[PDB]
Amino acid sequence: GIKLKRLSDKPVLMPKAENEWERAAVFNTAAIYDNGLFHLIYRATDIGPHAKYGKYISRLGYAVSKDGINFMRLDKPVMSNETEQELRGLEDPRIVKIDGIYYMMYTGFGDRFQDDYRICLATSKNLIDWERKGVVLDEPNKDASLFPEKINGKYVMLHRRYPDIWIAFSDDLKNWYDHKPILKPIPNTWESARVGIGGPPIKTKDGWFLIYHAADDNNVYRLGAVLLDLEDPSKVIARQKEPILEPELGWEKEGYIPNVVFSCGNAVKDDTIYVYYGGADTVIGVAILEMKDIKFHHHHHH
Template sequence: MVLQRVPENPILLPNPLHPWEALNVFNAAVVHHNGLFHMLYRAQGLDYVSHIGYAVSEDGVRWSRLDRPVLSPETPWEARGVEDPRITPIGDTFYMTYTAYSPQGIRACLARSTNLITWERMGIILPDEDNKDHTLFPEKVGGRYALLHRRPPDIWLAYSDDLLHWTDHRVIMRPRPETWEHLKIGAGGPPLKTDRGWLLIYHAVDAHHVYRLGAALLALDDPSLVIARLPDPILEPTETWEIKGDVPNVVFACANLVVDGTLYVYYGGADRAIGLATCPLDALLARLEEAASSP
């Protein structure tokens, strides 16, 4: 595997002292800001309603967390939870995409903050469809905001002038039949800008419902163009806590960031706990360049 797990894994576990996060913590967004790692993570109590909690760390491995959620269900569309946050800093504002879950369906939502703790809801951004795995690019592309999202089973790209109304939807990546990406794929954390393209970490599900992580490069000026895509996963469930949990055989990432040349990928293991795997950014980009040049 390209990614290497940190020995401290899992780095965040459910807290039985807090009912809202007593059962599961997983699928975390992470940003590095003012010298600290800030985590927004999905948490569930025994009622299986999802909330979003906050934790902070100096090294990205050892975390201190608030004893209350920073986002909890409030609207009818959020009746069963707010799920799978992904955070993109744009200018002085942090934008968090998340999934609203209710008996009516699932919807892509957006919130914003200047301090990562107090969040202002901006509403549903893809109102007419069930949609998940949505994440914003960290800067405009061709003068417009860009968003990845998932109309099953593919990864889609869309554009907006105001972050609320999205148009020009197009498929950019599809599953690869009879492989570890057979069933469906979805974006991980926000795409990372490199001098070789937008680095996309994504998840894929095989015919046996095993979730793995993959990597691809998208063209900087036109992210609908896939420059490279690794043929093999960069992380797959092998640890006991990734294999056995609330949903077995899952590694699922909502956060990828680069600090001092190291790629940090935060992921949920079996929908029960949170882990971290890393690698030198240049090493992964070299693998992708090799894949791009292969016939």
């Protein structure tokens, strides 16, 4: 089946003690290949990302690489906690580029009352200067992204009304309609508790290739793969039974949150997918998948 291949046993990005905003953890990064470079917009916290460590604030960093392994990083966050909806910061960004514009969906965590987090949108032409567009869906939700192109003249988003992956459609990026669930947890498996997107889906000749995450009943996080129909991505063509990535290395199994691999970004250079993922909500790693290796079992049964 499909399995992501780690390039080494070492993270590609680690917290940096010198800078308070990224002193504890860097994880769950957006990623895109553009103009001959890999770019990360990474989630960073000052404190370990759980209440037992403290009142962490998530901010978004920028890193850049020629090879997708060795990164340079900017000294200050490119987005910081600047609104009420973002009092506790910005989480788990997903980025696509459409017609010259980068569209980032992230979760603004306000923590002012129960379930005070929202999918928010920001745009950029350059990945450094971000313009907030505000809340996308006025409801507790997260794990959101646009598709990287319009389909049938509409913007399409993925979201996560608990505990399923949902899709929705928009003409104007402000009003969303035709909400429906497209992927659900499966009882008594590695993907029983909840599912959500990983990074944004990638267009393939055979359909939309979507990496997803799931948690089991022991709260272990793994990645999986699903293929969606090109014209109607609400239709699942295939869903791989087995995970494509699971916690194996020491820094995936242990850290601020044990036994987590979690992706918000998949960059493509020359038909190789570079899947960036958080390990234990502490560091960032990379694992690859060649596009020619995207193969699902063909079957037909109700």
